[PDB]
Design a protein around this ligand. Structure first.
Ligand SMILES: *[C@@H]1O[C@H](CO)[C@@H](O[C@@H]2O[C@H](CO)[C@@H](O)[C@H](O)[C@H]2NC(C)=O)[C@H](O)[C@H]1NC(C)=O
Ligand SMILES: *[C@@H]1O[C@H](CO)[C@@H](O[C@@H]2O[C@H](CO)[C@@H](O)[C@H](O)[C@H]2NC(C)=O)[C@H](O)[C@H]1NC(C)=O
Ligand SMILES: *[C@@H]1O[C@H](CO)[C@@H](O[C@@H]2O[C@H](CO)[C@@H](O)[C@H](O)[C@H]2NC(C)=O)[C@H](O)[C@H]1NC(C)=O
Ligand SMILES: *[C@@H]1O[C@H](CO)[C@@H](O[C@@H]2O[C@H](CO)[C@@H](O)[C@H](O)[C@H]2NC(C)=O)[C@H](O)[C@H]1NC(C)=O
Ligand SMILES: *[C@@H]1O[C@H](CO)[C@@H](O)[C@H](O)[C@H]1NC(C)=O
Ligand SMILES: *[C@@H]1O[C@H](CO)[C@@H](O)[C@H](O)[C@H]1NC(C)=O
Ligand SMILES: *[C@@H]1O[C@H](CO)[C@@H](O)[C@H](O)[C@H]1NC(C)=O
Ligand SMILES: *[C@@H]1O[C@H](CO)[C@@H](O)[C@H](O)[C@H]1NC(C)=O
Ligand SMILES: *[C@@H]1O[C@H](CO)[C@@H](O)[C@H](O)[C@H]1NC(C)=O
Lengths: 67, 29, 137, 49, 118, 94, 41, 94, 49
């Protein structure tokens, strides 16, 4: 079964290797959309799926061990 | 209307303009 | 065999327009997604973070083609292309063979099943998009 | 509508039109500038009471 | 739609035009197709445009509020996709229309305005 | 009372309507100009031609129609200055 | 044509024009109101 | 004395500054446009292309940026007529 | 000068800007390069006209 989580303002990355001062820059690129539904997998019994890609992947994780 | 062309309405209707004109007439007379 | 407790969050990227705000030190502190609701779209249209009062002719709109019909020809025979592509003898180039093609349904599947095709050059059209146009003569 | 006048529906065109710098936005802004003044013209002639 | 070569988009409706048996489609003034004849059923159909117009956002400023209302210029409120009001200037969504009168605040057009009134 | 007889004049008001109607009728008609393109309609090209070839064609139809918009907007600014000067005279007489 | 100056006394039957005349205690010699006008643009 | 309170208005003066600043910011930004050429830099063209073809690519960029200058100068003339009409009104009131 | 691909002309001077370790060069408002980082020595230099 699936389990979703609202990602509020996540996955905003630096688009290019250019320094910019106090400037509002309007870019157009592959971004994860704001206030979206990311999928909250567990894979723990052991079941990790083979997911598509389709245009990039934002991948967050919260693990104090090394798994 | 046409291929991306549009006409916007005026802010003041022509009734409202008539009310400005009648006020100028009533003030003056 | 035995593990702990994993959990990972997967989301997918989409082509979007953002408005990023770089502060003095070159770091990003805030961003506005120009397709969310309406005030962030207005802030990305103005290229500002303060919007004073008034109507701001932001984007635009236009309903979308729901479904899709395709009323085409009636049917007819097939116009045999193998008359011109499989004749026993071709005329020489000084008196070249000419043929007008009458109305039919023109399957170009055939005409592809012939040869390794040393030259296949369309000019006003493209061969990948040949099965949708409908020429008169 | 600059995009609908030039391209017109097509979407392969939109990526090509984004090349021509901001020639598009400037146009829209000038046209709207002629939109704010036209209402002020009327207020100044009639709204004197 | 595609009518034997004519590629386009729009709403198909019963027409009242009369084509000459040899004509397939008609065009209007300004040279745009406005009627076709179905190749299969031989009936004349008008093509009307799919609704459109600009979209503007009315905002008091983020230092006052984050609410907003949207006016769809000469769009009927039934063909857009609370407070929905139909005016001769388009469809107004997100503001309630009252019969009182105040001083212009944020001009909406054709005699109407709006403000952050309690 | 004689004023109505002289009316039943306003050519200066009809000219404003005519000038804008003519610019909008011309702006639309300029879309049927191959401008040096196989076809003058977009979709046909972008749908009866490959994806790298159609580039050239549409690029040829974009510059021409973009010039049309620049002509249109420049004239509206020059003509709006004239109606503005008239509105200033009318306000002064008022 | 000529550059006129006001008399030293600067007392015109009461009327007090100090807000529109130059301020002698300034490098620029602007008036108090002119100093505001160049501080807004 | 109440006049200072109403000040401590001049939007007509800030608009003049804004309009010119916007035309100068746009004029510079229009240099980063390819106008359908292989690149937007007249040196990079040569670095990776022969003269016969580089003359064509540079001629496209020249035409595009020359159009930018024509747009800029035409608007300055139309806008200078408006400030001139304002200076005439101010001189008349003076 | 040429800084790893950036071709231009101008005077090189010591800067006081701070780039993020992943950034090579900076641009000013109006989108023109105004500072670079020397690929060999890794120092930030302003470019004045
Ligand atoms: C081109 O013509 C030849 C002969 O005119 C066709 O060969 C015939 O093919 C059928 C079915 O494959 C056989 O039953 C006949 O015996 C063949 N005839 C001969 C003389 O060999 C061939 O099929 C034609 N090709 C096309 C694409 O029409
Ligand atoms: C196209 O072919 C169809 C037959 O496949 C023709 O069909 C019939 O049309 C009449 C007239 O409306 C109907 O009453 C019949 O019911 C249809 N037949 C069937 C089986 O449905 C049609 O007229 C042809 N049209 C053209 C332009 O050729
Ligand atoms: C003219 O008006 C100014 C104020 O606009 C007067 O100057 C102020 O006078 C008050 C006392 O009445 C002082 O408390 C203020 O400090 C003064 N201001 C300054 C800047 O000095 C001035 O005295 C008036 N002139 C006359 C002749 O009455
Ligand atoms: C690239 O190599 C050069 C080798 O000359 C490095 O320059 C030296 O860097 C060390 C470390 O700070 C200094 O002590 C030397 O004085 C430098 N040499 C000279 C001639 O000034 C340089 O740092 C290297 N760059 C990177 C990014 O590794
Ligand atoms: C996320 O999922 C819930 C339930 O499936 C849905 O109500 C919500 O609209 C989704 N969020 C978005 C942004 O679509
Ligand atoms: C980052 O910016 C702050 C001011 O917002 C400044 O005090 C601080 O020194 C800056 N950090 C660096 C490393 O320059
Ligand atoms: C804007 O916000 C500031 C506080 O950050 C406040 O002092 C000011 O009154 C606000 N302006 C308006 C118009 O509300
Ligand atoms: C919108 O359509 C309805 C019928 O569905 C009609 O009653 C109404 O008058 C229309 N509104 C406008 C503004 O034309
Ligand atoms: C406003 O008054 C009209 C009659 O003039 C009435 O028909 C209408 O319902 C009123 N509107 C509201 C919101 O009460």
């Amino acid at each position: 079964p699936p389990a979703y989580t609202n990602s509020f303002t996540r996955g905003v990355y630096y688009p290019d290797k250019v320094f910019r001062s106090s400037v509002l820059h309007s870019t157009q690129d592959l971004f994860l959309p704001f206030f979206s539904n990311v999928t909250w997998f567990h894979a723990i019994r052991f079941d990790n799926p083979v997911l598509p890609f389709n245009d990039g992947v934002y991948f967050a994780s919260t693990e104090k061990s090394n798994i | 209307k046409f291929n991306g062309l549009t006409v916007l309405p005026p802010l003041l209707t022509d009734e409202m303009i008539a009310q400005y004109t009648s006020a100028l007439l009533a003030g003056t007379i | 065999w035995t593990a702990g407790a994993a959990a990972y969050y997967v989301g997918y990227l989409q082509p979007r327009t953002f408005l990023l705000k770089y502060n003095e030190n070159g770091t990003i502190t805030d961003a506005v997604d120009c397709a969310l609701d309406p005030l962030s779209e207005t802030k990305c249209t103005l290229k500002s973070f303060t919007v004073e009062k008034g109507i701001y002719q932001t984007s635009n709109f236009r309903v979308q083609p729901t479904e899709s019909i395709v009323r085409f020809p009636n049917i007819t025979n097939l116009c045999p292309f193998d008359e011109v592509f499989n004749a026993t003898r071709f005329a020489s180039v000084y008196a070249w063979n000419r043929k007008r093609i009458s109305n039919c349904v023109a399957d170009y599947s055939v005409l592809y099943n012939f040869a390794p095709f040393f030259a296949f050059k369309c000019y006003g059209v493209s061969p990948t998009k040949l099965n949708d146009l409908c020429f008169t003569n | 509508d600059c995009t609908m006048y030039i391209c017109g529906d097509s979407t392969e065109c939109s990526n090509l039109l984004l090349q021509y710098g901001s020639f598009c936005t400037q146009l829209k802004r000038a046209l709207t500038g002629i939109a704010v003044e036209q209402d002020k013209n009327t207020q100044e002639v009639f709204a004197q009471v | 739609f595609n009518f034997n070569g004519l590629t386009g988009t729009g709403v198909l409706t019963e027409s009242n035009k009369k084509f000459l048996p040899f004509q397939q489609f008609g065009r209007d003034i300004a040279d745009t197709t406005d009627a076709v004849r179905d190749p299969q059923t031989l009936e004349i159909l008008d093509i009307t445009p799919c609704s459109f117009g600009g979209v503007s956002v009315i905002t008091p400023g983020t230092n006052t509020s984050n609410q907003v209302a949207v006016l769809y210029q000469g769009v009927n409120c039934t063909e857009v996709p609370s407070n929905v009001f139909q005016t001769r200037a388009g469809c107004l969504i997100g503001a309630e229309y009252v019969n009182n009168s105040y001083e212009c605040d944020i001009p909406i057009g054709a005699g109407i305005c709006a403000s952050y009134q309690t | 009372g004689k004023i109505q007889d002289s009316l039943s004049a306003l050519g200066k008001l009809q000219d404003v309507v005519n000038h804008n109607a003519q610019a909008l009728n011309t702006l639309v008609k300029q879309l049927s100009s191959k401008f040096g393109a196989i076809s003058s309609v977009l979709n046909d090209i972008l749908s009866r031609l490959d994806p790298p070839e159609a580039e050239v064609q549409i690029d040829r139809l974009i510059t021409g129609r973009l010039q049309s918009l620049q002509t249109y907007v420049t004239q509206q600014l020059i003509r709006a200055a004239e109606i503005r000067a008239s509105a200033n005279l009318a306000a002064t007489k008022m | 044509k000529q550059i006129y100056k006001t008399p030293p006394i600067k007392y015109f039957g009461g009327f007090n024009f100090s807000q529109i005349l130059p301020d002698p205690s300034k490098p620029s010699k602007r008036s108090p109101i002119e100093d505001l006008l160049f501080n807004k643009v």
